[PDB]
């Protein structure tokens, strides 16, 4: 088949076994959808991105873009578009898109299943595909008039872009320089040129795309504040039919050349530099852009973090095939007698380390954005966590960072594991497993590098939410370890769960510390990334273990076969991650509770 | 980038002089007629020549990689890398650490490796395709008399080689190798199979012949690798004599792979005898003993891919830093509140600083790990140095061989996505060439050997069969450093729990060992532990090292260094005081859980997976 291996199955058990979301299928919102329909559409969609999806995903990084400077735009490989007509063909760019709009209603926790897939086969073909969801984002925001351009943006497909970083502005969005002028006919031109923009053009894909661009009005006041949001369509259009019209003033200048994800064009965009104004409409015609845009960018997120463990994922099962039919060596047992039978290699201990670290990565990865999942709709929230809607979006918030940069960094590092399970064939492109390592090392920067991301977890998901969501979590971690087989691993996720708590209070007293003590508050910054970190092996280690415990439920009632198999494989990997990985975090609470200021006192000549 | 290639002399040499006393050999015995001032100086000139001509090609070779003509059987690559490659022949750099009757220049391994090191973090495919001369060194060493004329000529005409032992079924597992060795009458062989990943089989018209080193088994020989011989064949027939070079021999290159980095390293699949022409091979030595003889050449490949990954990290790390000294992005973290602050550079970023010094420590800790390596390698620098006789040097560099390699190639991959990061979005550029360093790095912990056949290797032949003569040489000098001013005094009771640790996971995998006397897959306990073994040494090395440094700068400062040496000294203190307080106390976690270790991984299904 496809280089894309899928674990529906996977999917299915966390999404009903574990987490009981289909006690919520076929009520109120989700009236119309139930279990076994949800599960079709899970494997409808592993089969599109096994299938057409999977087919361009060499293709597109072998036959990359090209920027037509003649035209200011970018042409696609032809495989590639194919993969996109049958992505649109089959209403897959729909999922998740509320009603109104042409969407079937669903969990945001099977929405990102189904997503799971696509970006696994090809990730750049949903980006490429986020149009509708843009557009619904766009409406929630806009005024009466502005919903209904939104309506027909989503009805028609058009494409979309999310428009804020400049040369000298990423990580510091507030320093943008972009300029909005304010036309007498309340439209505003917008004035700039933005850096890394995804999907700025795509060839004929579509026949409109809409920028949403931050950009600051003339006499706004500075940072992230001043700025505000505009709808910037690549052609104007009749507000009334959706009818296309002009070209708009906004023309990718350049594409870059990058070290994978390559089938998705990234371009410079300028905004009113060659000759017509580019048109934008203030959304919502209020001045709110920063919040308006975090819309927008939560779900980048999300869907960056769901794309590095999707990419683990496949990573893995493909090591595992290849593991399985790989002959070399004899067996450990056998080593001294060099005329031994030769076993494969799943016969010798480093393998098999290597491949149980893969899988309980990437199971303890899926579970965590699938938990993430079940608190961004509160009917979910209510129904399979009793947490009322205000608790569930301070969780949601918490977990993102979560998802977002300890998925990205996990994905990136164990792929490492499963390339190296090939041997030196997994240094060919004839597997797909370096690709995938290209692919995923973009996924620590763009949606904000993991810095950015372990500071918003402890200062803004923490701190400024004095600890509620985070305690939260805590409480349903020890309510798990407070409770036979699995008293080994409980014993080893309340060390953890202690070690995380001591971080959490070392970093706290070095912030408040930071009032009589200015510098103090670097030392948050220096154990910042490593917290996160932290927090993520503890969430993988609880629902791995936690997984266990149903796997346990299932083999006691009976389980056989393949269904045995798959509960004996979450009961080894649970206390693999509890005894290989958790313990680690005591050394790490004891390194953060011993930061200094001396690398930060160094003078920058002595690097 | 194209002078992509920033080199680090001064590292080298305050290594090489001013910590590990090299010097004190220059201008005595094998090196009379070599001061330490020359030595300077060669480093000074391979790391100029390496930033500039060698340099300048490292983007072509990966843009536009060799292409392979299947009807001719050869390559054809680009032009600037083979322009790269006269200017190393020019300078005679492919002849570094020669014997003298070769044309070389006498010189220690622990110089000769430095050297090195430029052309690997320039250009590391121009370096393997110039180990020719090298491997005809090797060649004359076990060679008969005859064989040494011959060795002598491919020495002095430049001849390029390879070592030819991987077949499809036989990668990690070399004793399983099928292609034959055919007696002749004459006492030739012809030599018939067909081998892959073959670095540098063919190699365009850099040079006039190339001398392939190949394992193959004489028809009824034993199996596994005691059953191999190494064989002496040439890609062209040639003069014993003068060096003439006659008719093609049968030995052809039939694929070209297509891999994620190092792209302008032709890797080939080579048949030998499968095109209607015999592939001759010349018994080396005249003897059947063919694993041993080319474990000299597979020594001196993992000494050279560990430094290959250091000499990586190090240009990467020196990237990143110039990039974040002038990078300007977002406020101070003491004024983050006020939205009106003035920005500055990153540099002034806690996590960026803790990013650097990561970067920095490990490729600091590893070029003196590397250093130190290189310093055992010579009896006379090994004796002058570290006061060690020729049969406890032999078995120290064996034992440290495996880390150069195996954490050497582990740890460099890892810490260049430190590198990357460090650029932001810049970082997945190919403007910039951190991720040709990382595409390029990420070969090393295959070749030459995997990181799981380097830890085997290091525990069961390095420590086991050595009865830990090495490894108890090693842990006595790190005991004495932290046995020996106070102002290290954390530092040393960091490094005494690291020394600790990694004596603990060499207990138990040992009591596991042990124990397999009584029950058989006790042993798979050993090699669950075996990689985390290896590379828990490499870090108590690295931060031993890096703390010996700290000593000798902390000196040099009281003494009253200035201006940019003072700079370098206070950086040296910096990092051993970070590498000990950051990365040495997780290897107390890592020894309870080999403590630890359980079959329970082994005993489940593989259907469970
Ligand atoms: C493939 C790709 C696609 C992209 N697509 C889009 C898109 O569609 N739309 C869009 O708007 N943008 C897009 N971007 C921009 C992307 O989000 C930025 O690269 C990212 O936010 C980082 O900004 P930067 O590149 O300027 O790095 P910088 O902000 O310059 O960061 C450099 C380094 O400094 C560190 N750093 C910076 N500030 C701080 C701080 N305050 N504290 C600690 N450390 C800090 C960072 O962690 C990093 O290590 C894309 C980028 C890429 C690579
Ligand atoms: C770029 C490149 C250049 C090369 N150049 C050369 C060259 O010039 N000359 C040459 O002779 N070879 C060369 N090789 C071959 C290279 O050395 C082998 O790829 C390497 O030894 C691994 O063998 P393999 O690929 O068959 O992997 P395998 O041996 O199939 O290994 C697959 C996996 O199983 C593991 N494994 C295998 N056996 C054991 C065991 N007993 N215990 C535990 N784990 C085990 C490995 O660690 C690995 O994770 C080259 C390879 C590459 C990629």
Not at 487 to 506: H, I, P
Request: with cysteine; proline share 3%.
């Amino acid at each position: 088949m496809s280089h894309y291996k899928s674990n529906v199955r996977d999917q299915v058990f966390n999404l009903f076994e574990v987490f009981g979301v289909d006690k919520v299928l076929g009520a109120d919102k989700f009236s119309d959808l139930d279990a076994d329909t949800a599960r079709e559409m899970l494997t409808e969609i592993a089969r599109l991105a096994e299938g057409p999806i999977a087919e361009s995903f060499v293709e597109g990084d072998r036959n990359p873009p090209v920027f037509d400077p003649e035209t200011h735009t970018v042409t696609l490989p032809e495989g590639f578009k194919k993969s996109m007509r049958a992505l649109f063909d089959g209403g897959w760019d729909k999922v998740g898109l509320a009603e109104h709009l042409g969407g079937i209603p669903m969990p945001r926790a099977l929405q990102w299943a189904l997503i799971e897939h696509i970006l696994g086969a090809n990730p750049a073909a949903y980006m490429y595909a986020m149009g509708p969801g843009m557009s619904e984002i766009f409406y929630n925001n806009g005024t009466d008039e502005q919903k209904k351009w939104a309506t027909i943006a989503a009805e028609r497909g058009w494409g979309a872009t999310m428009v804020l970083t400049e040369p000298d502005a990423g990580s510091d969005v507030g320093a943008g320089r972009t300029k909005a002028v304010q036309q007498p006919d309340g439209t505003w031109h917008i004035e700039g040129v933005k850096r890394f923009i995804t999907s700025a053009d795509s060839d004929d894909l579509f026949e409109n795309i809409m920028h949403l661009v931050l950009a600051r009005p003339e006499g706004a006041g500075p940072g992230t504040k001043g700025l505000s949001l505009f709808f910037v369509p690549k052609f104007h259009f009749d507000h009334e039919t959706g009818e296309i019209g002009e070209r708009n003033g906004v023309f990718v200048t350049n594409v870059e050349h990058k070290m994978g994800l390559k089938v998705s064009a990234t371009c410079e965009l300028s905004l009113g530099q060659h000759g017509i104004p580019a048109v934008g409409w203030l959304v919502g015609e209020v001045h709110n852009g920063i919040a308006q845009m975090f819309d927008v960018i939560e779900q980048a997120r999300m869907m960056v973090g769901t794309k590095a463990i999707a990419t683990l994922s496949t990573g893995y099962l493909n090591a595992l095939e290849y593991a399985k039919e790989r002959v070399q060596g004899a067996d450990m047992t056998q080593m001294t007698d060099k005329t031994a039978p030769r076993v494969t290699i799943t016969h010798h201990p480093d393998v098999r380390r290597s491949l149980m670290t893969q899988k309980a990565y990437a199971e303890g990865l899926r579970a965590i954005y699938l938990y993430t999942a079940t608190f961004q709709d509160a009917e979910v929230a209510q129904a399979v966590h009793g947490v009322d809607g205000d608790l569930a979006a301070r969780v949601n918030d918490l977990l993102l960072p979560i998802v977002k940069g300890f998925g990205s960094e996990t994905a990136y590092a164990k792929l490492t594991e499963s390339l190296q399970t090939l041997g030196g064939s997994g240094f060919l492109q004839d597997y797909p497993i370096e690709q995938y390592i290209r692919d995923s090392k973009i996924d620590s920067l763009y949606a904000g590098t993991t810095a950015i991301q372990a500071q918003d977890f402890f200062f803004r998901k923490i701190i400024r939410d004095k600890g509620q969501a985070l305690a939260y979590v805590a409480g349903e971690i020890e309510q798990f370890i407070k409770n036979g087989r699995l008293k080994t691993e409980r014993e080893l996720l309340a060390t953890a769960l202690a070690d995380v708590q001591g971080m959490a209070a070392s970093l706290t007293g070095y912030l408040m510390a930071a009032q009589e003590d200015a510098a103090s508050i670097y030392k948050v910054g220096l154990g910042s990334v490593r917290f996160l970190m932290a927090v993520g092996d503890l969430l993988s280690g609880w629902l791995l273990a936690r997984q266990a415990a149903v796997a346990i439920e299932k083999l006691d009632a009976g389980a056989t076969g393949a269904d045995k198999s798959f509960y004996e494989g979450k009961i080894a990997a649970a206390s693999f991650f509890a005894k290989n990985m958790l313990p680690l975090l005591t050394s790490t609470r004891q390194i953060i509770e011993n930061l200094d200021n001396d690398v930060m006192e160094l003078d920058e000549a002595a690097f």
